Amino acid sequence: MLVSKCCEEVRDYVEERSGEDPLVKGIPEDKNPFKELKG
Amino acid sequence: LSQITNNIDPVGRIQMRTRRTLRGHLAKIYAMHWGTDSRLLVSASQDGKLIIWDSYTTNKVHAIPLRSSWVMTCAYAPSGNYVACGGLDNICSIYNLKTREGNVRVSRELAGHTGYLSCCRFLDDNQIVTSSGDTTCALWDIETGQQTTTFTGHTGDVMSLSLAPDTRLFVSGACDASAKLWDVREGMCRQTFTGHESDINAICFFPNGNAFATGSDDATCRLFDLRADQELMTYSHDNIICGITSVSFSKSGRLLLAGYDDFNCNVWDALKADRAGVLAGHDNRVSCLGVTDDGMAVATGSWDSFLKIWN
Amino acid sequence: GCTLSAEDKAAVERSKMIDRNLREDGEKAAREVKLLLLGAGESGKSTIVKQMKIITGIVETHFTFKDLHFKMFDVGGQRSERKKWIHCFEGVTAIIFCVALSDYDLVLMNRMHESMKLFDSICNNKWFTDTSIILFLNKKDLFEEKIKKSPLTICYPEYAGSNTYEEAAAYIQCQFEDLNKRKDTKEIYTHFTCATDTKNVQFVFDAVTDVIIKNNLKDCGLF
Amino acid sequence: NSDLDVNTDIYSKVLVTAIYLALFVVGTVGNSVTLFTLARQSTVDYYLGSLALSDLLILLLAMPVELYNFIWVHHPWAFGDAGCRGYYFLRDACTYATALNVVSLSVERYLAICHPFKAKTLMSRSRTKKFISAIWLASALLAIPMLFTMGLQNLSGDGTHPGGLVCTPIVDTATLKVVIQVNTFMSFLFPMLVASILNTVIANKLTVMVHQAANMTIEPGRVQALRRGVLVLRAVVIAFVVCWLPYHVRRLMFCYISDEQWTTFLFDFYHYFYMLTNALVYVSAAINPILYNLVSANFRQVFLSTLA
Amino acid sequence: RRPYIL
């Protein structure tokens, strides 16, 4: 059922969501909850 | 898909460090599900325990002693009130986190199955879908104890299951190499997907809820579309031949995390079908991995009894 | 050290008491001896469970013998693809495989040939490379009757031995123990049993001791 | 200005060089083939590889310099100041590596048999590689005192001859005595204790299991390996005592006698006994692969099949 | 006469 349109939908969905994604953009390590803060 | 989606610039090399490490288990871990608050995660293993960790402080907020040690799956309800677990005992036992007596306790033992339970997912606090060992899937209602809608129609036994984000429907995979898109409300299958050589071991929805990837014993992840009713992409690479035990997407969908039996997890660019990164933490089969709904952390459990949390 | 006002310390104390409960139950499990039961056609699976526990899936019997605890996993209740859940059972100390002797002549294709192929598929499996097999041969007196009346060439064509008890039993035993493609790693332990001979659980514990001693020697730098 | 040279019989010197070369070739071949075999449960493999590695390093480092610089040229240091410091640093780091490896292997076997859960939790390949790296770092830290104590000194007739220079502890006798006696104290009296008592209680467990093996209905030809396990256990403990006792008795002898008791006869006896003690430590470092070889006659087959 | 040997 028009697989090109559907994979283009997957593409535009992810490229819409790629920027605010905290793993492909990455972390700034100060907004990271997984800074360790231990000794 | 790679001929279309190659104009987008690549993600670059992904380097992630083990931001936490959740020790305590004495066997192979088989499952892990985040919470919808993205802080608690449950993780079950063959030593009779499932343990509700706090991912930030590495604290064990709970540890539930199970009646039969053989446990293939677990799920964490989106309220945070319930957990579930089932294995070779054919019983998807249900535990109530938020008790007034301060401890967890078994609410219902869900019986009446002639096979091991491959997977459980929570719809609501009163609806739970499972994936059995008699080649069927089901949907239970916990308050009655009766299975509401039994899903019959596979020939080889079913191996995974993945609810959609809006939980109106779900996808289950089996040894037929046929992923089927069931429907919760009506009660019949809608679409059947072939395209794998052998058995499929891992299914995860794309975050929009309009697609899903599928990890198999054929060293091939294959992302399918539900509307277009056919295979869309074949995430596979040469020099690797081992099986896949778990898959999960990122929050945006840009990177999919595949769990191989070369003892380490690989990170696939979901658009160019490139191995974008290697997560080389574990020293045995990576049996389960999962990404937070907030998209910040990725925890991965394995048969060396170590949950690592990468970021 | 921040303690976040008395509750992070009590959370860590909760975590440590959970760790304590984990290590105690883990010691109880790590000292515990796990045994697999196999066999499709009924082959004394009952007879052996009634003889074990006297002193609708999997059925666990947690009996003790000679001051040592035994877990017996009657796995033949549930029927599915064995290729997708047998890896839950790596780390089982000893598999207790059971064959009826008297099923040499029945047909679904010989049932005995099906039991040999099942034994083959389990003994040469990629997970059970180190785990030894306690082979049982069940219903021997019935089998004695059935071999005093009917011959044994009908089951296996290429055999021309005596129609005696000891030789036919030795030929079936040597036909089973020839199937292991590996012998440097594990070793099959055969016994003849029926609904008599109460000398069973001592032979079970002798086999479990020999497998556990060979696992311990291997785990040591010796052997 | 040539003195302190000890005039020994040349046939005894040739005869201990031949022993040293035999232990040299045997230890190098044995340790090379064991590391290649272990390189081609995992924790006892890395433990045996670390002990064999430490023995190969003690041979290839210590053996040819000690050979050339005590047997042939008995007085001058061939290797300079950092040569002395590096020689005693390596040598004593390898001594602590060997002693702590045999400690760890004996605790691992005692753990592996009498506490199987506690040995499951204490053993992981991540933890074992971290632990062996830790024990090599600790052998280097405990060998730092053989850096700062030791050095060059000129003990010629007037202290100015370029050939009167020796390689000696440059510190006084009380500090020397305390450093060397705490080395011999912890590095030997603690491994003799753990090896003796642990391996004794393992041998008790194995002899009870042998008496319960004489389960003859279950038993194939596999009571040989239990007697062989008793023999290799006892070979480990006896070889460690007999090979690392005379070396530290020699160093004790150097430790206590303040030269008021030394004569010419004890001088000569000390030099010949030094030769014999380095013979025994190389016998240890070469007879590890032997008594791990000969007991595991299938792993032995693996050795000789890879060699052929 | 002290041996320096160690």
The domain ranges of chain B are 18-310
What is the Cα–Cα distance from C52 to C59, expressed in whole angstroms? 13
Task: Write out the two tokens for B31.
Answer: 């499952």
Q: Whose CA is closest to C116, among C73, C173, C162, C194?
A: C173
Helix ranges (DSSP H) in B100-141: none
Burial class (CB in 10 A: 0-12, 13-18, 19+), C81: middle
Q: Is C123 left (phi over 0), alpha (psi -120 to 50) or beta?
A: alpha
Cβ-based neighbour number of residue D271 at 10 Å: 16
β-bridge pairing B18-22 and B307-310: antiparallel
Beta bridge partners of D77: none
Contact residues, B window 49-88, toward C, CB-based 8 Å cutoff = 49, 51, 54, 57, 59-63, 65, 68-70, 72, 87-88
Q: Whose CA is closest to B210, among B195, B223, B192, B221?
A: B223
Task: Write out the two tokens for D258.
Answer: 């303040």
Element (H, E) at D46: helix D42-57
Q: Whose CA is closest to C214, among D270, B241, B132, D218?
A: D218
- Confirm if C223 and D230 have CB atoms less than 8 A apart: no
Which residue among A1, A6, A21 sits closest to B250, beta carbon to beta carbon?
A21
Residue entry with tokens 């064999």: D52
Q: Whose CA is closest to D100, among D143, D46, D138?
A: D138
Q: How far from B10 is each of B31, B41, B224, CA to CA, in Å? A: 31, 31, 22
E3 neighbourhood in chain D, CB within 8 Å: 4, 6, 254, 262, 267, 270-271
User: In chain D, at which residue ranges do the beta strands (DSSP E only) sit?
Assistant: 150-154, 165-169
β-bridge pairing C94-100 and C132-138: parallel
What is the Cα–Cα distance from D100 to D142, expressed in whole angstroms? 11
What is the Cα–Cα distance from B223 to B208, expressed in whole angstroms? 13
What is the Cα–Cα distance from D4 to D299, expressed in whole angstroms? 49
Helix ranges (DSSP H) in C92-192: 111-123, 140-149, 165-176
In CATH terms, B18-310 corresponds, of 2.130.10.10, 1.10.1200.10, 3.40.1260.10, 3.90.25.10, to: 2.130.10.10
Q: Whose CA is closest to B163, among B110, B117, B206?
A: B206
Which residue among B251, B271, B298 sits closest to A11, beta carbon to beta carbon?
B271
For D183-214, the DSSP string reads HHIIIIIHHHHHHHHHHHHHHHHHHHHHHTT-
What is the Cα–Cα distance from D40 to D268, expressed in whole angstroms? 47
Q: Whose CA is closest to A14, among B293, B269, B204, B226?
A: B269
Beta bridge partners of C69: C64
Looking at the complex, report in whole angstroms how far the Cα of residue E5 sits from the nearest Cα belonging to chain D.
Answer: 7
- Confirm if D112 and C220 have CB atoms less than 8 A apart: yes
CATH class entry, domain D14-307: mainly alpha
Looking at the complex, report in whole angstroms how far the Cα of residue D195 sits from the nearest Cα belonging to chain E.
Answer: 27
Q: How far from D283 is each of D38, D58, D239, CA to CA, in Å? A: 22, 12, 9
Subunits close to A (at least 3 CB pairs below 8 A):
B
What is the Cα–Cα distance from B36 to B20, expressed in whole angstroms? 19
Whether the CA torsion D116, D117, D123, D126 is positive or negative: it is positive
Where in the sequence is the domain holding C190, given as residue range(s)? 4-223
Distance of CA B308 to the CA centre of its chain: 16
Element (H, E) at C133: strand C132-138
- Confirm if B198 and B244 have CB atoms less than 8 A apart: no
- Confirm if B246 and B253 have CB atoms less than 8 A apart: no
A30 neighbourhood in chain B, CB within 8 Å: none
Which residues are CB-neighbours of C132 under 8 A, at least 6 positions away?
C94, C95, C186, C187, C188, C189, C207, C211, C214
Contact check, Cβ <8 Å, D120/B26: yes
For chain A, helix, strand, coil in percent to 5 are 40, 0, 60
Q: Whose CA is closest to B49, among C23, D213, D247?
A: C23
What is the Cα–Cα distance from C77 to B269, expressed in whole angstroms? 44
Does any CB of chain E come closer than 8 Å to the CB of residue D42? no
What is the Cα–Cα distance from C205 to C68, expressed in whole angstroms? 9
Q: Whose CA is closest to A15, among C123, B253, C11, C85?
A: B253
Helix ranges (DSSP H) in D115-172: 116-122, 125-141, 145-148
Number of Cβ pairs < 8 A linking chain B and chain D:
6
Residue entry with tokens 């993945």: B162
Contact check, Cβ <8 Å, B253/A14: yes
- The one-letter amino acid at B231: E
Q: Tally the domains of chain C.
A: 1
Which residue among C26, C78, C81 sits closest to B47, beta carbon to beta carbon?
C26
Residues across chain D:
308
Task: Write out the two tokens for B3.
Answer: 């001929």
Looking at the complex, report in whole angstroms how far the Cα of residue D216 sits from the nearest Cα belonging to chain C.
Answer: 9
Number of Cβ pairs < 8 A linking chain B and chain C:
89
Beta bridge partners of C191: C136
Q: How far from D174 is each of B142, B301, D178, D179, D247, CA to CA, in Å? A: 80, 57, 6, 9, 20
Backbone angles phi, psi at C190, to 5 degrees: -100, 140
Annotated binding-site residue numbers of C: 42-47, 74-78, 138-141, 195
What is the Cα–Cα distance from B82 to B77, expressed in whole angstroms? 5
Contact check, Cβ <8 Å, C189/D226: no
Q: What is the DSSP letter of C82?
A: G
- Confirm if C44 and C193 have CB atoms less than 8 A apart: yes
Resolution in A: 4.2
Burial C162-181 (b: 16+ CB within 10 A, else e): eeeeeebbeebbeebbeebe
Cβ-based neighbour number of residue C38 at 10 Å: 23
Beta bridge partners of B279: B265
Residues across chain B:
311
- Confirm if C133 and C61 have CB atoms less than 8 A apart: no
For B260-297, the DSSP string reads ESSSSEEEEETTTTEEEEEE---SS---EEEE-TTSS-
- Confirm if D69 and D83 have CB atoms less than 8 A apart: no
Residues across chain C:
223
Beta bridge partners of B86: B73
D124 neighbourhood in chain B, CB within 8 Å: 304
What is the Cα–Cα distance from C109 to C113, expressed in whole angstroms? 7
C217 neighbourhood in chain D, CB within 8 Å: 225-226, 229
Task: Write out the two tokens for C65.
Answer: 């013998």
For B170-231, the DSSP string reads EEEEETTS-EEEEETTT-S--EEE---SS-EEEEEE-TTSSEEEEEETTS-EEEEESSS-SE
- Confirm if D211 and D203 have CB atoms less than 8 A apart: no
- The one-letter amino acid at C78: Q
- Confirm if C89 and B46 have CB atoms less than 8 A apart: no
Contact check, Cβ <8 Å, E6/D155: no
- Confirm if B266 and B279 have CB atoms less than 8 A apart: yes
Subunits close to E (at least 3 CB pairs below 8 A):
D
Q: What is the DSSP letter of B10?
A: P
Looking at the complex, report in whole angstroms how far the Cα of residue B230 sits from the nearest Cα belonging to chain A.
Answer: 8
Subunits close to B (at least 3 CB pairs below 8 A):
A, C, D
Element (H, E) at D15: helix D10-39
CATH of the domain at C136: 3.40.50.300
